[PDB]
Structures are given as structure tokens and as C-alpha cells.
């Protein structure tokens, strides 16, 4: 392996030699430089004008090793910045890599899959350009087998990852017919036993559901919700994360779409999610809760039935502030859409004190959200003649002192809502 630690100059020398073997070893030397951890000299390789050469090498059917070496080299260049990815595309790599997907050498088709994943991963324009060149059909053909388990683990992982990049990004979202075409294969990958394939399949589904309800509907109608819910309960954090994101995405949609998440048993996992030691899981889970409490009354009722109100009190009592912010949103939504009975239950679970404590916060929006919530709870207290008991409760936990101080707040939505609450209930 005397292709170790070459200069760029020597690589250029060998590549310009018109000796295919000399080209092969110089290309391998480039692969090695480009596959090093510390500052691989991507720009120096680009400046030397090597990309068109590498691309031409992809087409050398008669010399498989150089196809492999250049595929690897181009992969690592395309993994760089957008400008570096663009240089690979500008050299015509896209159709060349797509032709390689049909190679008889698995390590070469795999390397093409990888490279296309890096190009598509750059953003929506390159994603859509890879689609226009017709990548999807030969990619899906690689997975047209009776049992995915007969495929090499690394190979299957690379294919899944690349497919997820075709599902990825917005402005614009991927073409509808593309998504339609990829979906049945994704649904199948979502049922595979490998933790990495599972994660990346979940990421893919998370991307597709990040948008307008019509995108969400395409996914929901495939029947993947129960499987997403199952994956929500996995032990592996890299599976739970994209599974939770996808579920969160779906409940931003219609009441009907939100009902399928509930019907699939999602709420039963929330006691763990809302107490998860990973901050981002707890925050995402609480956000999802807030969008569920923005649903119908019967859906608020299922939140109650699953014992999730005390978990919301817990999150409101102690959590990362951004999670507490989502919890406040969850409560205001609850108190806006809930019945009198459901609102009363909330107080009985102890919502008032941690609510009042967050009034000291240095964020204007959560103050607004909270003041709205207590306003809604008073409006429920009226229909019971028990507004007096609530005033005292709020006075006792030091809440009234907090609301008085808000009458002289910078913001105006704030100082009004405060004084408003004061003159109606505390006078």
C-alpha cells in the first residue's frame, strides 16, 4: 500500500499519466488523503482539477478498482461544504453515480448510494436534481428482495440513510410523486430489526410529516402510526428521538390525525417521555402534549384518563425552562378547550402554585400564556360560584403579589391582563 501520504502534486502526476494502473494507484492515494480524520485536503484536491478525472473514472466498467477508489474519493469531497458538494455535482457526478447503482460489485453500488446520499443531503435543490436524474428507481430496486435480512447490514444502512435524505428538507418539500414512490419501501424498512435502519427510517418519516396536513395524511394513510408508537417505546435514544418527532409532527395536523396517534396508544408512553432524563426528549414530548391539549374535549379527556395531568404539573414545577414554557402552553390550551369539569380537575392536581411561580420569569410570552390560562380558569370558576376560593388559593401561594407587580410591566398585553384579573377577581 505505497499509496500512503502522497502529495497532491504526485497524485496529479499519476492521474495525468494515461497509464490506467498509474491512475488507479494515484486515485487510491487520493482516497486515502481524503479519508483522513484531520483536515482532509478537499479544497487542494478540488483546485488541482481532479474532480472531472474522478468522474470519468466512475465509467471505467473494465477497471472496477478505480471505479471504487474514485467513488470513495468523490464521496468524501461531496460530504464537505455546499461549495465542495457543488464541485462534485458540477463535474457531472450525478448521472455517473446513478449508472453505478446497477454495478455487479456490491461495494461499488454501495459507494454510489453513499455519494448520492451526500449530494441529496446538501439541500432541496440537489435533492430534487438527484431525483430528476432518476435515482429513485435504481435505489428502490436494490431493496426489491423478499427479506431485507439477506442484505449486508452496512449496505442496508447506507441505502436507508440515503433514502431519508431524499425525504429531507423543505422550501420546497420533496415532490409528491417521489414521496409516493419511496413510501412503501420506507414502511418496510420501519419494520426491520436493525437499530440504525430503524432510526433512519424514523428520521425519514419525521421529515415527510414536517409540513402541511396533506403530507402528514400520505404518511398516516400508510398505517405507520402504530409502528411509530411502538418505536416510541424503544430503549435506544437514537430511535426514540426521531419517532417522537414524527409523532409530534402528526399531532400538529387535524383532530382526526391526532386521534390516530391516541388510538395507537401513544399517551401511555408519555409518563416516561415527560420524565425523560434527556432534555430534548422532555421538551419535544411536552410540546406534543400542548398540541394534544389543543384538540377536542374527548382528546383532553384521554390526556386526563392516562394520568398525564400530574405529569404536566411535574414538568411545570421543575424542568428546563423551555420545557416549562411548552407546559404552560399545554395548560393554556387545556384551559381554552376544556370543559368546566376538566378545568377544575386541573386545579385539584395542583396546577396553580407552579403556574404562579413561573410569573417571576424573564420571558414575556410565557407571562402572556400563563395570564391567559388563569383567566380561563377563573372563567370556569364563575360557572360554579367558586371564584372566591380561587382568589384565596392564588393569594396564598404568593400569586397575587406576582400579579400586582405585573400591572407595572413593560409590555402592554401584560399590564392590562393583570389589572383586568385584579379588578374582576381580587377587588
Amino acid at each position: 500500500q505505497g499509496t500512503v501520504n502522497w502529495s497532491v502534486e504526485d497524485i496529479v502526476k499519476g492521474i495525468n499519466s494515461n497509464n490506467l494502473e498509474s491512475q488507479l494507484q494515484a486515485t487510491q492515494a487520493a482516497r486515502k488523503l481524503l479519508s483522513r480524520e484531520k483536515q482532509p485536503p478537499i479544497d487542494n484536491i478540488i483546485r488541482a482539477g481532479l474532480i472531472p478525472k474522478f468522474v470519468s473514472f466512475l465509467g471505467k466498467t473494465d477497471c472496477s478498482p478505480i471505479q471504487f477508489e474514485s467513488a470513495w474519493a468523490l464521496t468524501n469531497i461531496a460530504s464537505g461544504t455546499s461549495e465542495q458538494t457543488k464541485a462534485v455535482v458540477d463535474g457531472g457526478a450525478i448521472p455517473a453515480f446513478i449508472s453505478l447503482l446497477a454495478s455487479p460489485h456490491a461495494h461499488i453500488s454501495e459507494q454510489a448510494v453513499w455519494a448520492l446520499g451526500n449530494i441529496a443531503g446538501d439541500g432541496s435543490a440537489f435533492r430534487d436534481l438527484v431525483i430528476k436524474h432518476g435515482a429513485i428507481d435504481p435505489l428502490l430496486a436494490l431493496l426489491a428482495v423478499p427479506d431485507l435480512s439477506t442484505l449486508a447490514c452496512g449496505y442496508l444502512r447506507n441505502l436507508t440513510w440515503t433514502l431519508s435524505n431524499l425525504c429531507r428538507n423543505k422550501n420546497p418539500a420533496p415532490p409528491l410523486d417521489a414521496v409516493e414512490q419511496i413510501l412503501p419501501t420506507l414502511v418496510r424498512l420501519l419494520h426491520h430489526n436493525d437499530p440504525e435502519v430503524l432510526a433512519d427510517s424514523c428520521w425519514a418519516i419525521s421529515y415527510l410529516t414536517d409540513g402541511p396536513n396533506e403530507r402528514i395524511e400520505m404518511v398516516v394513510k400508510k398505517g405507520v402510526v402504530p409502528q411509530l408508537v411502538k418505536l416510541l417505546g424503544a430503549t435506544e435514544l437514537p430511535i426514540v428521538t426521531p419517532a417522537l418527532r414524527a409523532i409530534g409532527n402528526i399531532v400538529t395536523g387535524t383532530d382526526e390525525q391526532t386521534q390516530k396517534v391516541i388510538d395507537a396508544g401513544a399517551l401511555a408512553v408519555f409518563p416516561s417521555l415527560l420524565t425523560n432524563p434527556k432534555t430534548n426528549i422532555q421538551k419535544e414530548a411536552t410540546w406534543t402534549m400542548s398540541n394534544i391539549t389543543a384538540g377536542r374535549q374527548d382528546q383532553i379527556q384521554q390526556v386526563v384518563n392516562h394520568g398525564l395531568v400530574p405529569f404536566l404539573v411535574g414538568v411545570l414545577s421543575k424542568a428546563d425552562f423551555k420545557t416549562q414554557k411548552e407546559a404552560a402552553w399545554a395548560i393554556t390550551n387545556y384551559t381554552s378547550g376544556g370543559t368546566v369539569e376538566q378545568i377544575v380537575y386541573l386545579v385539584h392536581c395542583g396546577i396553580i402554585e407552579p403556574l404562579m411561580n413561573l410569573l417571576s420569569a424573564k420571558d414575556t410570552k410565557i407571562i402572556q400564556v400563563i395570564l391567559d390560562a388563569i383567566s380561563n380558569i377563573f372563567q370556569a370558576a364563575e360557572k360554579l360560584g367558586e371564584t372566591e376560593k380561587l382568589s384565596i388559593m392564588i393569594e396564598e401561594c404568593g400569586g397575587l403579589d406576582k400579579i400586582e407587580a405585573l400591572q407595572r410591566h413593560e409590555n402592554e398585553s401584560v399590564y392590562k391582563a393583570s389589572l383586568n384579573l385584579i379588578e374582576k377577581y381580587f377587588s
Partner: peptide, 8 residues
């Protein structure tokens, strides 16, 4: 529906 929020 109108009270659904996007991820911030």
C-alpha cells in the same frame, strides 16, 4: 385546530 402550534 387554530391553537395547534409549530415546533419553535
Amino acid at each position: 385546530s387554530p391553537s395547534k402550534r409549530a415546533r419553535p
